[PDB]
Amino acid sequence: ATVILESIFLKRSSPLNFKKRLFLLTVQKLSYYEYDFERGRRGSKKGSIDVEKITCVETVVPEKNPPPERQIPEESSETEQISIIERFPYPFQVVYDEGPLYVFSPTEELRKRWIHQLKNVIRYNSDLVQKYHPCFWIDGQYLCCSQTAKNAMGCQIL
Numbered sequence: 331a332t333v334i335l336e337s338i339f340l341k342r343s344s345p346l347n348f349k350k351r352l353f354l355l356t357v358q359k360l361s362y363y364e365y366d367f368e369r370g371r372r373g374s375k376k377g378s379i380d381v382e383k384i385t386c387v388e389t390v391v392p393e394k395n396p397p398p399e400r401q402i403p404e405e406s407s408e409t410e411q412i413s414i415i416e417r418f419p420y421p422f423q424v425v426y427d428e429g430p431l432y433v434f435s436p437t438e439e440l441r442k443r444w445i446h447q448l449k450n451v452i453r454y455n456s457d458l459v460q461k462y463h464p465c466f467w468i469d470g471q472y473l474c475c476s477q478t479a480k481n482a483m484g485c486q487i488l
């Protein structure tokens with residue numbers, strides 16, 4: 331039940347919005363929670379995914395004109411301290427039965443760390459896919475294949 335990885339990520343998904351969440355990875359589950367900054371501790375649980383139910387973990391093609399909150403910097407005035415909890419420019423994908431979960435990492439190294447660990451723990455899942463969507467699902471379709479089913483088969487082999 332011990333946590334393998336712990337990070338603050340920007341989580342996405344009608345109405346599409348982005349919230350800061352504390353992500354936890356164990357061998358069994360990935361849970362995400364609210365972060366109580368005022369008291370500096372983990373807050374209320376918001377979601378949990380069975381690791382064995384995950385079918386795909388990959389990066390996502392970055393959006394074209396992203397808001398500052400997802401754009402790399404002024405980090406001379408702002409230390410890494412501020413930017414590492416305000417800027418989340420690197421997205422990756424976590425696909426399970428309900429569909430794709432989109433998560434934004436503050437650094438490339440941290441995304442690399444999480445994708446690597448995730449791949450390790452899902453290595454024996456029965457349903458790993460062979461095709462996936464490298465582009466985000468938005469307003470009823472994937473931007474990579476124009477397919478309008480959230481669980482439509484992937485259009486790219488990797």
Ligand SMILES: O=P(O)(O)O[C@H]1[C@H](OP(=O)(O)O)[C@@H](OP(=O)(O)O)[C@H](OP(=O)(O)O)[C@@H](OP(=O)(O)O)[C@H]1OP(=O)(O)O
Nearest residue numbers: 341342343344345347348349350351362363364375376377
């Ligand atoms: O408005 P937030 O504080 O961002 O919470 C949202 C909101 O959930 P709540 O109604 O519980 O506040 C979303 O719900 P809708 O706007 O779809 O009604 C919900 O999505 P789901 O109910 O569809 O699960 C989403 O959660 P998620 O992105 O896990 O789907 C969840 O955001 P958080 O789960 O990240 O707090």
Ligand SMILES: O=P(O)(O)O[C@H]1[C@H](OP(=O)(O)O)[C@@H](OP(=O)(O)O)[C@H](OP(=O)(O)O)[C@@H](OP(=O)(O)O)[C@H]1OP(=O)(O)O
Nearest residue numbers: 331332354356358359360361362363375376377378379380
């Ligand atoms: O939030 P945690 O401290 O990680 O507690 C988890 C969590 O339980 P709750 O979030 O409901 O308290 C798991 O529950 P879910 O994510 O399914 O809702 C549950 O996992 P199981 O589904 O396998 O019961 C698990 O129980 P366990 O570790 O006995 O497997 C339990 O951990 P605790 O027993 O430490 O509360």
Ligand SMILES: [Zn+2]
Nearest residue numbers: 463474475485
């Ligand atoms: Zn596609």
